[PDB]
Amino acid sequence: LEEAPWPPPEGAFVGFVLSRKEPMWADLLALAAARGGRVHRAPEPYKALRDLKEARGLLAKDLSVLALREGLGLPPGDDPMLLAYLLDPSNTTPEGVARRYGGEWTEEAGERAALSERLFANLWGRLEGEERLLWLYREVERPLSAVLAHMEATGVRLDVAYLRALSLEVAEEIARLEAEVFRLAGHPFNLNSRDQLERVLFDELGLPAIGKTEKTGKRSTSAAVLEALREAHPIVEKILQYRELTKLKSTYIDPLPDLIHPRTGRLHTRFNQTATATGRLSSSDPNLQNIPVRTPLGQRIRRAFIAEEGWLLVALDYSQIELRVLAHLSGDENLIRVFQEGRDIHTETASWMFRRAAKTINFGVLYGMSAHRLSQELAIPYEEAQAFIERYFQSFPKVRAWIEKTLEEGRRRGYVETLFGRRRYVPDLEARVKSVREAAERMAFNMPVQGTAADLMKLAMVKLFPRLEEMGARMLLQVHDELVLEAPKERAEAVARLAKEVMEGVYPLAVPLEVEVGIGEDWLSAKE
DNA sequence: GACCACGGCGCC
DNA sequence: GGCGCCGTGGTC
Ligand SMILES: [Mg+2]
Fold it and tell me: Which residues lie within the region annotated Polymerase?
């Protein structure tokens, strides 16, 4: 309540306001600090930002990123958001956290500062006795905050000219497809409108409408529905190609070039730390965790991500991290042997259940896929699909046992846990409507494996980052079970070696963790 | 110019 | 299973 002049005492909680949500692009409108119960408001923010030793408060990372932008080394420290997020992943927003635990998220810097000091005490207390959740805060989450700050502030270098050339070329190909579609349509119309396209296909042309949209109940025109109509008419062939190009052009090719920062000449994403229910990171503004890789055009877009002059990119990907984690949690002897002997999984899992059929189940068992789905995709009847599943479990029994065990606990305790003890509360496991319940169950037993893979990758980044500094290298991107680094080409070899070891042995399980590494000048070449 | 819901799709 | 962003359509 008391107002002392700037600056504040040591260890004060920071509050701040931005002109916009992206710290790399925002203008610092005001900052303040709180300690004990009194507030310190800065006359001139950018100047005053140098008096601080660490950014400590709600959204600590954001301010830290902006400080880095200004050439200031202001590391992020404590953040009540991370405490609330560990107590319950559904706590994803300051406004929400405040409205739940107390206080009010306003747009006045001083008010935000006081809010941080109070909410921190509150939540830090609520974390009394919860040692495993406390271990995650000290040893993983809080330290990762500072790593992510350097990733966002470093950005990635982009080949802008390359994407300009590619935009025109792709624009050229879209023109040919739009044309031949209008020809078979008998008239022109908006192809980007699924409402217009529904009419031409299912009414004008005499095509069968197989499925409906969720909320409104219209005849769907999704790629699945379309693929099924591939034989009925040559028009859908071209529409499927049209969608492919438009998607890749509207989302990646056109926008990314226009998001280069002038001060850096690089592209800057945001890594959100309290955004998912399983403990995963998410990415936005822009999302660099969903850059295309599959199709030919998609691969060309990924070549536009390049290293600095005199530097190389280093790409490290875990192999079947989620399946290897399931082996550890399930304790299933057989599945462990497959990994322990270091053999190709999707062939050994076939041999020990009697190729294609082997993969789809391993992929889908984590998601608890429908017996009808395996029948639909693998192009096999319902009974053969339904039998294969029972056959998979007869081979890996402790897996099925682990699923049933997991759900029983979730019904009793109200939550499920990862190996390190990250909680997700899943309510409707005792729902009396089967579809609601069985949906909640799928959410339930998946969380520990996705969440445990997320814990290991997070922990590796924490351990790796100090080592990269000793060698003058950088952490650039993260894609759930992948990392992209940047080293000087003189030392990139050694960095790839060390990074691999750090990731693999981050937390020895019942099986080994394997990492595939590659070095290239662009994101694409650094894998092939 | 802002925001919103929906269908649709990119990635792990 | 877990995300975020696109254009369309509609509203203020
Ligand atoms: Mg949606």
Answer: 117-528
